[PDB]
Structure 1
Amino acid sequence: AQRVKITTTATPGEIELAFEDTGTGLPVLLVHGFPLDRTMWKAQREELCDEFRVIVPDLRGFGESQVIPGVATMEAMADDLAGLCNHLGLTGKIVLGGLSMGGYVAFAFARKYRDRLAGLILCDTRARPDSPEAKENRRRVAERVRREGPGFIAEEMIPRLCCESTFRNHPEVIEKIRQMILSAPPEGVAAAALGMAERPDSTDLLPALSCPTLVLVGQFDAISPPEEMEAMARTIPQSQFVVIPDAGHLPPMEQPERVTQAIREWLRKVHT
């Protein structure tokens, strides 16, 4: 992995991002969920790099990246991604993928950096903003995580993140996810929670998209259910919708081979 100071149009103008960059060819940048880190996408990075260039950053405030206290808007996160691609000399088009919060970042990127997208991969996410109660709950999470750390978040989220089959067959995957949460920087988690609260409604962005889009969801996703994701996909032109069996909210970790395959086969067409 690498750690580089990049120039970003978001405050504070410069930020240090940690990231993986593996393979050659078409660039595919994959964005993790909340409150996880780049290792969420490790199986896909390690497998897809035989055919594509896979770039996987820790977002601001997560993993090994710089923590910028206050609010980390989805726009700011997207600006950082643009600045990373600029740093790397990927100044043309990329495929951008994101899971959950990372999908919110992808929407912010598509808003602002349309002409940099060859394609979008939207996993286990939604285009609607937070409801008023959801916003308030973000503020409560932010306030508490700054003081107590993310243990309470792991306790609340783990049962909602993965399906029953994962708990049974892959307890090691559960534990990897738990350690990602437990290790997340408290002020980075707070800043992202506040950023999620403030994110705009992307509903009307979707019909205006101009690149092919893959929409992927776990069969048993409790957080962004498949029914709602299918409806979201029907608003996106040039979309493909895939349900990953025997996965909850984290298909890349729960069913890594099936996710890698779905992405690989879709990328081949974007690419050809």
Structure 2
Amino acid sequence: EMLKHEYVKVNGIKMHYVTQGKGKLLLLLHGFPDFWYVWRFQIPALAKHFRVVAPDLRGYNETDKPEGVENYRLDLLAKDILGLIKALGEEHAVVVGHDWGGIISWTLTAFNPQAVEKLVILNAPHPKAYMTRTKNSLRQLQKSWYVFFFQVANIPEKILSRNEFAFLKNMLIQSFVRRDLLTEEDLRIYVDAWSKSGALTSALNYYRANLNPDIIFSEKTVVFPKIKVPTLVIWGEKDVAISKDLIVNMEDFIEAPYSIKYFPECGHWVQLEEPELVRKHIEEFILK
């Protein structure tokens, strides 16, 4: 097998993806500020057993980038993935989501359980956990300083991109518990992805559509069906973006069997820091 790049129309947008392997559809969904490439250490190994598909989400890298905050609501992003499963000629998929990819995955699974065989979450809080607990967690609000920063128009784009995205490289490198995690080559590939016209605005629109202060401080209770598909949560405990307050007590959200694998020596980018152990836990979960 060899890593192939494709494009497919889904839900009115053209979505780029890399793919390798045959078998069950296994989706790997990245978050901010990543793209398919974050999955570089898992694609080959998983492709031994599965039809691995790693897309660029709406707004990222080679995928279409519709204009306006409203086009980045969670409901539309989950519909993109539902549409992608269909367009790949399948009824369901194993769905693995990191970060925004995880939030989307939780949403897809909750509202369209028939389309998801098994769910894997890496370092992505359950949306109802986030909406309920964040306003009550000083620690989370503090960690979410940058979420508030990203609400403001234009200024965050300018600050993040200036000097060849120095600010963004720093934010990323500050978050890793492993040194020299991105090579100079890696950083050049990331900058190409970041530099795609409209990408940075589109990425930041995720926070403006879904995590504005109105949603965070809403008094209204959030309607979110229980998760009814077998679920694995992988969690690097040294996460600079997410408090443990947000991942404890998943019971009230998940009716199907679930398990949580804590990585006490990893942070947010658990798939980069223990690539082989993550790959293993994912394989074992699917194949048993």
Q: CA deviation at 1:250?
A: 0.4
1:229 aligns with 2:227: no
How do 1:134-213 and structure 2 match up within 5 A? 136-140=148-152, 143-150=154-161, 151=165, 152-159=167-174, 161-163=175-177, 166-167=178-179, 170-172=180-182, 176=186, 180=190, 183-184=193-194, 185-197=199-211, 205=224, 208-213=226-231
| Cα deviations by residue, 1:139-159 (Å, 9 ceiling, x for unpaired) | 12x532444554333333431
Pick which of 192-201 and 65-74 moved more.
192-201
1:204–1:233 distance in 2 versus 1, CA, 3 Å: farther
Preserved contact between residue 19 and residue 53 of structure 2 (Cα < 8 Å): yes
How do 1:16-55 and structure 2 match up within 5 A? 16-55=14-53
Preserved contact between residue 85 and residue 92 of structure 2 (Cα < 8 Å): no
Q: Is the partner of 1:67 in helix, strand or coil?
A: coil
Task: State the one-letter code of the partner of 1:187.
Answer: T
| Cα deviations by residue, 1:200-249 (Å, 9 ceiling, x for unpaired) | 9998747x211100000113222224564243367423111112253210
Number of equivalences: 256
Match of 1:248 among 267, 272, 275: 267
1:181–1:227 distance in 2 versus 1, CA, 3 Å: farther
Match of 1:7 among 7, 10, 15: 10
Q: What is the CA–CA distance in structure 2 between the aligned matches of 1:204 and 1:242, rounded to whole Å?
A: 27
> Which residue number in structure 2 is paired with residue 220 of structure 1?
238
Q: What is the CA–CA distance in structure 1 between the aligned matches of 2:176 and 2:250, rounded to whole Å?
A: 21
Consecutive unaligned residues in structure 2, runs of 5 or more: none
Task: State the one-letter code of the partner of 1:246.
Answer: E
> Which residue number in structure 2 is paired with residue 107 of structure 1?
106
Q: CA deviation at 1:179?
A: 5.5
Q: What is the CA–CA distance in structure 2 between the aligned matches of 1:39 and 1:116, rounded to whole Å?
A: 25
Q: What is the CA–CA distance in structure 1 between the aligned matches of 2:85 and 2:120, rounded to whole Å?
A: 17
Preserved contact between residue 228 and residue 254 of structure 2 (Cα < 8 Å): no
Q: Which has the larger radius of gyration?
A: 2
Q: Is the partner of 1:21 in helix, strand or coil?
A: strand
| Cα deviations by residue, 1:77-136 (Å, 9 ceiling, x for unpaired) | 11111111211101x121111111111111221233221111111110112136597564
| Cα deviations by residue, 1:150-182 (Å, 9 ceiling, x for unpaired) | 4333333431x211xx12xx4436973686367
Q: Is the partner of 1:54 in helix, strand or coil?
A: strand
Preserved contact between residue 44 and residue 256 of structure 1 (Cα < 8 Å): yes
1:22–1:220 distance in 2 versus 1, CA, 3 Å: same
RMSD (Å), alpha carbons: 2.9
Q: Percent identity?
A: 22
> Which residue number in structure 1 is paired with residue 66 of structure 2?
68
Consecutive unaligned residues in structure 1, runs of 5 or more: 9-13
Q: Is the partner of 1:110 in helix, strand or coil?
A: helix
Preserved contact between residue 217 and residue 226 of structure 1 (Cα < 8 Å): no
> Which residue number in structure 1 is paired with residue 115 of structure 2?
116
Q: Is the partner of 2:110 in helix, strand or coil?
A: helix
> Which residue number in structure 2 is paired with residue 11 of structure 1?
none
